């Protein structure tokens, strides 16, 4: 009937679950000491006034005043953060051949850093790896604006002088094409795992319903808010509270804490 965290772990142990799909959000980022915008952080952000938060990811605002966005980019630009244990756990899932797909709401790029190959990833809100001139459309490796950003200078096209914008997806914009994998990944999965997000926001929320009835949906996260609440299913399992704790429990139940430990150790030194 109602399943437990341990059941789930045992189903994974017992490779009854071999094709896990994972969706993550900001709850797995805050432990790497990435800020949460949803304070204190805005120390970086509030100053030039955002008239309201979402402006950070509105184009018209950005055109009128890009400074706040680039403060944020400077914070998250790769180098300046490291994968925490929850990434490394998803890395272990991959390395054991168990991971069909990881969908991430985070723009920190910590999943690739952690070691998960690009083919396993969907970066549904984009990436700082790359950029794109807001006017002329010419695209750029991410490093060719590193220093401007690192100096708090607003980068500018050589071609046309417009503002050059990292390929983070703004409000209003099409998500990546790679998002469209969901149609085949979700019905192929035999476990859905949701970490550090409740998925209140479409079109993530609607994604949750695309797995078959038989397939356990495990959330580890402080709350439930989204469609696990609106439309619960019998094989659902909620492990509410602190993300890291939740995941520590699950690794103990898998029997993987020592192997995790080994992996963390090797990558820290790499």
């Amino acid at each position: 009937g109602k399943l437990s965290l341990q059941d789930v772990a045992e189903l994974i142990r017992a490779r009854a679950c071999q094709r896990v799909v994972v969706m993550v959000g900001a709850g797995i980022s805050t432990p790497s000491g990435i800020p949460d915008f949803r304070s204190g952080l805005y120390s970086n952000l509030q100053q030039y006034d955002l008239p309201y938060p979402e402006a950070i990811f509105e184009l018209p605002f950005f055109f009128h005043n890009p400074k706040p966005f680039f403060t944020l980019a400077k914070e998250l630009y790769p180098g300046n953060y490291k994968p925490n244990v929850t990434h490394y756990f998803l890395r272990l899932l991959h390395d054991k051949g168990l991971l069909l797909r990881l969908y991430t709401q985070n723009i920190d790029g910590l999943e690739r850093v952690s070691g998960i190959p690009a083919s396993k990833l969907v970066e549904a809100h984009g990436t700082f790896a790359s950029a794109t001139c807001t006017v002329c459309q010419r695209p750029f490796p991410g490093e060719d604006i590193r220093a401007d950003v690192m100096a708090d200078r607003v980068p500018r096209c050589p071609v046309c002088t417009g503002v050059v914008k990292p390929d983070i997806v703004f409000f209003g914009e099409p998500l990546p094409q790679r998002f469209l994998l969901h149609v085949v990944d979700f019905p192929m999965a035999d476990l859905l795992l949701i970490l550090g997000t409740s998925l209140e926001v479409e079109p993530f929320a609607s994604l949750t319903e695309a797995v078959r009835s038989s397939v356990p949906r495990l959330l580890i996260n402080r709350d439930l808010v989204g469609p696990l609440a609106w439309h619960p299913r019998s094989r659902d399992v909620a492990q509410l509270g602190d993300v890291v704790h939740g995941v520590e429990s699950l690794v103990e139940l898998l029997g993987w804490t020592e192997e995790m430990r080994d992996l963390v150790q090797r990558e820290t030194g790499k």
């Binding site: 990811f57 809100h125 997806v169 703004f170 409000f171 209003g172 914009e173 099409p174 998500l175 998002f179 469209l180 079109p203």
Partner: peptide
Amino acid sequence: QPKK
């Protein structure tokens, strides 16, 4: 094609 779907929008953020």
